[PDB]
Structure formats: C-alpha cells, structure tokens
Symmetry: D2
Subunit: 164 residues, 4 copies
Amino acid sequence: HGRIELIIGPMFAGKTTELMRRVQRHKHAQRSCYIIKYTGLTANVSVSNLHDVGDEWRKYDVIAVDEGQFFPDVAAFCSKAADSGKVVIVSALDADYLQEPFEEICLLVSRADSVVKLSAVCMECHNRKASFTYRTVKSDERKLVGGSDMYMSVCRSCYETKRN
Amino acid sequence: HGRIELIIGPMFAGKTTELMRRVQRHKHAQRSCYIIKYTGLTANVSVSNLHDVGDEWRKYDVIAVDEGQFFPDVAAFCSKAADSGKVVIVSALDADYLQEPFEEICLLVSRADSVVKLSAVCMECHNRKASFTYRTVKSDERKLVGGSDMYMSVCRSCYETKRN
Amino acid sequence: HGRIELIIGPMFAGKTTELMRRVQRHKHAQRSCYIIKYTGDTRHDQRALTANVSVSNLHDVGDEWRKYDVIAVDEGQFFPDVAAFCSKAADSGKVVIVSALDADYLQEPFEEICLLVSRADSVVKLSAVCMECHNRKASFTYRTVKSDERKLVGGSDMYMSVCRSCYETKRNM
Amino acid sequence: HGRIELIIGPMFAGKTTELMRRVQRHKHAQRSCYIIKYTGDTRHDQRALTANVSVSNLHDVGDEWRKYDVIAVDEGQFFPDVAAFCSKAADSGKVVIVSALDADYLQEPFEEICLLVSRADSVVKLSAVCMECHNRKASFTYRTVKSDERKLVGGSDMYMSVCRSCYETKRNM
Ligand SMILES: Cc1cn([C@H]2C[C@H](O)[C@@H](CO)O2)c(=O)[nH]c1=O
Ligand SMILES: Cc1cn([C@H]2C[C@H](O)[C@@H](CO)O2)c(=O)[nH]c1=O
Ligand SMILES: Cc1cn([C@H]2C[C@H](O)[C@@H](CO)O2)c(=O)[nH]c1=O
Ligand SMILES: Cc1cn([C@H]2C[C@H](O)[C@@H](CO)O2)c(=O)[nH]c1=O
Ligand SMILES: [Zn+2]
Ligand SMILES: [Zn+2]
Ligand SMILES: [Zn+2]
Ligand SMILES: [Zn+2]
C-alpha cells in the first residue's frame, strides 16, 4: 500500500528537483499527484500548516511536500497519508545552519521507507562535496527565508574555517 | 582529477532531469558546464557527432552529454575528457526496445566511476517499477526518435505480456 | 579529509555487514581501521579482522582512536555520546563509519542518531524483508517479547523487521 | 514477481559481501536462497550459510534452481551463459542477484555482463579504494603479474584496484 520517501541534504543539493523527478515518473503512469509548497493527474498548493490542506490530499495517489522542515506537523501528516495508501515524498533540510537537526525531520527519518541524503558542492573551496549549510548573515532566527546571498552549502572543513 | 558518471535506465525515468540536477550543483559552486544535446559559467550545443564539438569542451570544468546512446564515439570522447581532468556526466539508454544493449554505453559502464540505473513506473499496469522500454509502433529501425505515443516504459512481466 | 558516514535501518537489514564491507575496502588500501563495539552487544564475527575494542561508552576508548585512518562504530544507538565522538574524530581527519538503529521498537527515534544524521556526509537507510508477510520491504523493527525497557539486547528470539502495515496489524494484537 | 539485480565494480569493492548481505535479508524472511559459485574460483566463506553449488557453467545446475525463491550468482563474468540463465529464472518468478566484474584488466567489458546490465531491474556499481595512491575511489582493476590470458584466477597476489590516473601511470611502466 503506502510509503514515505524522504530526501534530505543541505541547500543547493537539488532536493526539490529530485522530488519533482519522482513526481514526474508517477505522472507518466497516470497517477494523481498533489504538490504541497510552503509559504508564510495534478494539483498544486501553497500553505503554512498541513492542517490547512484539509482532506483534499485524499483524492490523490501521490503526495509531495517541499521544504518539509517549515511545517510543524509534517511527520504526523506523512504517517496518516501513508497509512491511507498514499505514496508520500518529502524534501527537507535535516540540519539547520548550526548543524542541528529539525526535530520533525528526525521523526520522518524513523518513519520513512527510504531516506536519501543529497550533497551539494562546497561554495567556499569549490573542491569537495558539501553536506552543510552555512548562514552568511547575522541572525539568530532559526527560520530565515533566503538564497545564496544569505546561505552557502559547504564541506565539513570550510564550515569549521568559516565558524571564525 | 577527472571522472565519468553514467546515468542509465529506460525512458520516462528522468535521466535528463538527474543529469541537470547534477549540472546545477556544479554551477552553484561557480564551475563551468558545457551541455551537449543530440540532434539529427554555462554553454549549450546541439550536435550529431562528438567530433563536431571540436576542442570547445576544453574550456569547461564539467561536460554533460544527453542521449548518449545516439553518439557513435561517446565512450572515447568521455575517456579523453576525463583524462584531461573534466567531470563528465552522461545520460543514456542502456537497452534498446528489444532489451539489447547499446554497445557504446556498455563501454561507458566499464569506464565509469559511477553508474546509476534509474527506474520509471510501468505505463501498462501502473503498479510496479519499470526497467524496460517497449516500442508501441512497428519499425525495425533501431533509432527512431519519439515519445509516449511510440514508446512506453514497462516492468518485466508487462514487457513479456505485450511481446504478444 | 574527515567524514561521517551513517548507515541506518531496522534490524535484519545488514547494517553491520555493510559497515564491515566498507572497512574491508579501506583495509585493501592499507588503511588502519578500528572497530568499536558495544560491550553489552552479544551477536563469524567479521569485526575481529582488524583492531577492535568493546566498550560501554566512547569515553573509554580514550585517545586510542587517534592511531587510525578509519573508525567504525557498530550499534551506535547504544552509545550515549556518539555524536560528539564522531564529530571530534571527523574534525581530526578520520573517516568515521557508524551503523545504528534510527528507530526503536515503537518507531521513535534515537536522539543521538538524529544528531548524527545532521552531522553526516552520507546517510543510507537500508531495508530488511518483512518477516511477517514475506512480501514487502521492511523499514521497522517489531519487538516480539513483552518488555517496556527501551534497551533490550537480542536477536530474532526477541525482534522482527516488518513492513508498515504488518507493524500496524501486529500492534493491534 | 521476478527480477535481476546486478552488482558490478572492480575487484576489492566488496561485491560478494553485498551479494551475501542481500541473501541474508531474504533468509530472515524465510525465503529459500541458492548460491551458485564458479568451480574454478578459489577464495570465512559466507556462501556456505545457505544451499549452494560450484559449477563451470549454469547449464550444470540443471533445474535445481527452480526450488528456490532467490538465486545468487557469484563471479558472473566467468559463466558463458549467464545472461540467458538470469532471464529464464527471473521470467519464472525468481529474485536473481548477480555479482560480477563489468571490466577486465584492460578496462574492456565482459560482454555477457553488458547483456545483464540491459536486462537488470537494478544495477549498482561499487568502488574500491585505490591500492596504489590510497587517496581516491578506485573503479578499475590492474593486473600486477605478466599474463595475457583474459581469465586468470587470483586475488591481491595478482591484482589491485586503482583510480583512473594510477591506472594510466602504471600502464606507462
Ligand atoms: C539552513 C537554513 C535554511 N533556511 C531556509 C533558507 C531557505 O529559504 C530554506 C531552504 O530551502 O530554508 C532556514 O530557514 N534556516 C536554516 O537554518
Ligand atoms: C528504446 C529506444 C528509444 N529510442 C529513442 C526514443 C527517444 O527519442 C530517445 C529516448 O530518449 O531514444 C530509440 O531511438 N530506440 C530505442 O530502441
Ligand atoms: C529495535 C530495538 C533494538 N534493540 C536492540 C536489539 C539488538 O541488541 C540491538 C540492535 O541490533 O538493539 C533495542 O535495545 N531496542 C530497540 O528498540
Ligand atoms: C580483472 C580480472 C579479474 N579476473 C579474475 C580474478 C578473480 O579470480 C576474479 C575476480 O574476482 O576474476 C580475471 O580472470 N580477469 C580479469 O581481467
Ligand atoms: Zn570546502
Ligand atoms: Zn507492468
Ligand atoms: Zn509485511
Ligand atoms: Zn590512485
């Protein structure tokens, strides 16, 4: 019946591209896919609690959740949908800019049938796989929406070096 | 220094999306990428022999070749470029519609640092991973350019069943 | 230089075998490899093919780990300080390879292995085959004896790996 | 129902260990597993943990394979009829798992394993660690003794796995 697939890794690793790659595969076989985006055959939605999707997700074979770390109830949602027979596919950061985990994505790891962690390329040294996201601006808000001028994906030693 | 990464699998598996996912990762780290398409920071090209790229590829860190099975000299090209220090990334069909291999992509398998085979979803039964491409029109031309109205990706047993 | 590779999944998924596969690769290239096992864990021991030690926490290895290129930690969920140990060692240039359960018998995470996920360069989650229905990939471990101790050391005499629906079916009974 | 899983890569990459990891998973779910080895291949034998046989070609197994859920073929490149055997068995509903070299010591493909790639549901290529430089992933096998026999049975006494540039450097010498 149902399942949970989780795609994790730092920023700039292509997690969302991989999520969509997987959604597209299902669409070619005539499966209905519902894509849930965050904001503070097919159907799309931008939302801020998974509670706000209501029961719309039940009309679909495949449910995809992007930026899963922004949703506070994501693990319970995914479990409920997978228990109802859906293929659920989630892309999320596993770690925040302090290399500390998103507790809800932890729960997903433990509930997932598959977990892939993608890597990026180090934006500091340009020579190594990157597994970490470095926040290049001062802020102690955990959630801070932004791109390459506020964050960069780095290798282990560039992360240490830049922590000075 | 250099390497060869190969992405194989049947049609509708998202091989090209995965190739581009990888190219994008490199671009975020300021690496130059040259993309070579078939037709009968960045640069694109449509060509029919890899001979026709000349030595343009030497100006790039990363070389990507799409639809590799259409190029008759692809293995030697990839080896030459990887021996010169390039990251080479190739997407190709491993098997033709008769489940017979493309001999040049065989050579690549043996020369590659990494080989991933993606799956599609079965377009006949809609219930299983698909690893094969079934040609739905009569033709005994090996090369026959087309989409879902001429081909479908199928699972092992749907391929047998449809072979009647 | 250094890195953390994590292998997770339920019981019966071959996590230790994958660990030892990776160690052997390094050994062919003449790299020094140290395997750290948990002293309480009782289960051919492939882990006797290089330098190794049995401890109850990682503090008791002392600084012996510094003498190696590669450090492998088996049954990582048993060690209370595993994340920090791994990070210290990977910061000193070691290739650190850890096998661990990500989830306990209640599908609740081991918090220390959660930290490792976030610190790891590589994370693979292996599957088992459902030992109840025999027809599906299994991602969960089901405890088949009555005990509410979170830690309870054992094998197929006390646990089985199951698919998502077999885990539900068996919990309701 | 049936499938073909292929594990390729150079020597010292742990292909047989991965094969036996997969067999063990199936065994925990009580599935019948048969391991077919090559009679000429001399190299703890994990492959003695289920039903097994040593043959020179696959024809000599006869129909014994039909009694199993899972068939594993080790050193597939030695068998002249391996592709057809695998396809026959996978068409009868078996999970067939093959480990093999994809490339010989000259980086030239084993044609029969090429056919398997095209017939396989899953293909993984494992790497080794470069046994010359000790600093890079290795995807090639280098023969360290003089012999132009394509088939020459041996281990680290006759071969080493190497990265792309170490293979060039050593060929020029
Ligand atoms: C690493 C990190 C990223 N982000 C954001 C930046 C982007 O908008 C988004 C990454 O997709 O999440 C945070 O909010 N906090 C963090 O700690
Ligand atoms: C399976 C198969 C696909 N193709 C084509 C169809 C598409 O144009 C392309 C797949 O990208 O290759 C062939 O030319 N021959 C074949 O046997
Ligand atoms: C799933 C699970 C296993 N175990 C034990 C059984 C084994 O000895 C070890 C896993 O190999 O962990 C626990 O102690 N708690 C649990 O929740
Ligand atoms: C690379 C290579 C290995 N071998 C042998 C050595 C081993 O006995 C077996 C690989 O495990 O294959 C060959 O016979 N020819 C070759 O080209
Ligand atoms: Zn770096
Ligand atoms: Zn089908
Ligand atoms: Zn089950
Ligand atoms: Zn080397």
